[PDB]
Each structure stands twice: as C-alpha cells, then as structure tokens.
Amino acid sequence: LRSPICCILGHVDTGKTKLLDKIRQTNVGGITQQIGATYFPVEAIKQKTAVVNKDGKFEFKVPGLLIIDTPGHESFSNLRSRGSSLCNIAILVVDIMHGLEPQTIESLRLLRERKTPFVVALNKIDRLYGWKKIENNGFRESFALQNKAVQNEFRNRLDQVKLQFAEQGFNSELFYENKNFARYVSLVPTSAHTGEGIPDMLKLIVQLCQERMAELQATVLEVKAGVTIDVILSNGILREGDRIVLCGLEGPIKTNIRALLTPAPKGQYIHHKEVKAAQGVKISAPGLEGAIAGSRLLVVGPDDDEEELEEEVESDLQSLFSRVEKTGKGVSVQASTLGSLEALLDFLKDCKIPVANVGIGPVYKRDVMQCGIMLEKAPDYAVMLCFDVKVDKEAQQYADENGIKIFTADIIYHLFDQFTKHMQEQLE
C-alpha cells in the first residue's frame, strides 16, 4: 500500500514552521527527511497519538504519512483536476489569538475550489492567559485541567474564529464536537510550543485519510538551479535512467533520469537505483531548463509513444494558454505554477476581466513586449496581472519605459482591486 500525503498551509507568522518542527521531534523506523518533505512511519505516528488512543481501539491501516511543508501556494502547484496526486489532505494553520487573516482566507477559497479536504490547526493555545501546559498531551485531556477563566477565553476565541469561518462560507466545529466530516470542517487546537493537540491532529488526519480516501503519479514541486527538479512521487516507481517527459516553458522536455537523490544522513546526497511512493525526491537530468512547477512527470515505457506523451504533459499548460479572448483585447496574466495560473484565470473570468495574453514563470521582457502590443491595440488593457511571481528588473525597466503597468500580488483579490483602480484612472 502507499502513504497518504498531507500538505501544511498557513499565513506567515502563524506558526506552521514551528508546528512542523514540533511534529518532527522524536526519541530516535524513524522519521526521515526527504526532498521537500518529511516521512512518518506508522510506528512513529502510533507513538505520537498513543496518548489519545489509550484503549487501542483505533486501527492504523496505513504504512505511513508524508507531510509536505507548503508555505505560500505550493499545495496548489498542479492543475485542480489532479490535486489529490499532490495533496490527499491539508492542514490549515490559524493563529487562535488573531483569528482569520487575508492569506488564510485566500487559502480557504483555493482549498474549497480544488475540493481539497483539510483540517484546521487552531495554533498557539498556550498563549491563552493562565494556560497550564502538559507537554505533548491530547487537547481534551489538557483542557479538562485548565481553570475556569482559561476555558472561558478558549470558548470565546473559538466562537469568534467560528464566526470568521462562517462568513467565508465554512461551517466549522471543534473536532471532538464535530460529528459529520461532510458537514463541518474540524478545528483542532494546537500548540507548536508545548505539542498539545498534535496527537489529536495526527490521529484525525490518519482517520480522515483512511475512512474517506481508502499508474504513475509524480509532480514537479520545485525547480532549482545544474538545473534539478524536486518531485513528489505520489504513486508508482521511478528508476535511474528512466525516460521522462515533463512540461517546459518553451515546449515539452524529454530526458533521462541521471540520478535519484535524497539528503544524506558523508556526501551531500545519496543516490538511488529506484524510489517508490510516497516519496519526495530530487531528480538530476540533462536539459531540465525551463521546467514548469506543478507539471506532471511521465515515464516513457517500451510500448509508449513519446510524442503522444509529450503532447499530454504539455496539454495542461496549453489548456491554460488557450484560455484567452477571441477579440484579442485584454490584459496579460502571469503566475508561477500551473495551479496558480489556473486559479488566476478562473478568478479573472469570474470578474469578467478579459485576458489576451497568458504567461508562466517569472516575467521577462518578451512577456512585457507581448503585453505592449495591446498598447497599440487597446491601451487600457496594456497591463499585466502577476500572481505570486518574480518580475525581472529589465522587464520592469522596459515596462516603465514603454508605459506598461505591471501589477503584482501575493493575493489574487489585490490584482482585481489594482486593475479596477487602473481602469477608473483611465476613465478619470
């Protein structure tokens, strides 16, 4: 069998890094660091959840859990239709003391559109005034030992957070009060500081994956400059020397896996003849320049037709490139990954904003030039809406020289706001 994959999402300063760090802690099958991910064998999970499984009734049917730290939008890297190949389930981290934030809200909307199951970590409960910690305890067990004032503050903050979620269209319940997984999103109070609530969280993640979610699937999660690719192997086997095709900026990329690399526990990496799901692995291969984050990775077998596979891997990006106005009058859009780009196109289509040009990866002069033609065509739309992407300095300079506006945002809403402001300025 294989291990479910869990992605951890959160607003900055919400304690996701500290949380994953606390989840990693061990007395040591050992918890093992992998490329862009951390693997938890079922024994380690049993140990971390034992305190909330004292009777032993809970059955683990799973070999392990893979957890990917996904700060920002990497959990949404691939196209929506394949979301489960990247993340079976997610953990959304919210600071209980400040409640819902904008990045959190965007994360919520994106998780909902992609139909990605998630639970919420209501983190930093130790910040409750007078909280009496019991390290690594289950939340209920610790909560029972708190004074009246602490319980009161918890309930108040909880009701408030529940309201903020309700406004966003999500019905939420405290996890042990939660009765139906289909009806409510579970809120699990946690402390990255004390470890409290983490047993509950791991047990719940495992429970949901098993109860609800009981061919090769591999996704390019990151591209690192020679150029190597960090890949999440969700299903199947990858082997050294495998003939692979993936999505590239200027067309399909076809090459052969030179090396399968994981971090050394010495040299820097250890090589593998082969790796099996679920695994985060680094791939070394010639000609990986222009690889697209969020791209599928396909292996060309003996019966397979490499051309058809090239077409198939490029088809995601092409499906995005084709989503443009027939009129040819519209804005240019750009994003870092297939999923982010898809989200941007869907959002703008909802906003009835017309798009004439679609780009992926960091913004370069060619993208800005392409936008610049609109300036001759229809000047008002000679702008770029750029979602979570870097803008090359020369591209920005060229834009400023030629009166092309480049709008950038970490949140998709802001692109809309900025564009509306721009249009009102043009009509002003």
Ligand X SMILES: Nc1nc2c(ncn2[C@@H]2O[C@H](COP(=O)(O)OP(=O)(O)O)[C@@H](O)[C@H]2O)c(=O)[nH]1
Element of type H or E holding 311: helix 306-321
Q: Which amino acid is at 220?
A: V
Nearer to Mg ion, 13 or 304 (CB): 13
The one of Mg ion, ligand X, none whose footprint includes residue 304, by CB under 5 to 8 A per kind, is none
Taking the complex as a whole, the smallest distance from the CB of residue 69 to ligand X amounts, in Å, to 9
The one of Mg ion, ligand X, none whose footprint includes residue 18, by CB under 5 to 8 A per kind, is ligand X
- Bond into 278 cis (ω within 30): yes
Q: HEC states along 166-218?
A: HHCCCCEEECCCCCCCCCCEEEEECCCCCCCCHHHHHHHHHHHHHHHHCCCEE
**30 labeled binding residue:** yes
DSSP strand pairing (64-69 vs 5-10): parallel
Taking the complex as a whole, the smallest distance from the CB of residue 110 to ligand X amounts, in Å, to 17
Which CA distances in Å does 136 have to 3, 19, 83, 146, 365?
24, 12, 32, 15, 52
Give me the long-range contacts of 256-261 (CB less than 8 A, separation at least 24). 256/285, 256/286, 257/283, 257/284, 257/285, 258/284, 258/285, 258/286, 259/283, 259/284, 259/285, 260/284, 261/35, 261/228
Nearer to ligand X, 13 or 59 (CB): 13
**31 labeled binding residue:** yes
**248 labeled binding residue:** no
Number of neighbouring beta carbons within 10 Å of residue 164: 17
Taking the complex as a whole, the smallest distance from the CB of residue 12 to ligand X amounts, in Å, to 5
Nearer to Mg ion, 70 or 186 (CB): 70
**18 labeled binding residue:** yes
Residues that bind ligand X (CB under 6 A): 10, 12-18, 123-124, 126-127, 191-193
Residues that bind Mg ion (CB under 5 A): 17, 71
**237 labeled binding residue:** no
The one of Mg ion, ligand X, none whose footprint includes residue 74, by CB under 5 to 8 A per kind, is none
The one of ligand X, Mg ion, none whose footprint includes residue 193, by CB under 5 to 8 A per kind, is ligand X
**192 labeled binding residue:** yes
Nearer to ligand X, 104 or 217 (CB): 104
**16 labeled binding residue:** yes
Binding residues for GTP: 13-18, 30-32, 123-126, 192-193
Q: Which residues are annotated binding-site positions for Na(+)?
A: 13, 30
The binding site consists of: 13-18, 30-32, 123-126, 192-193
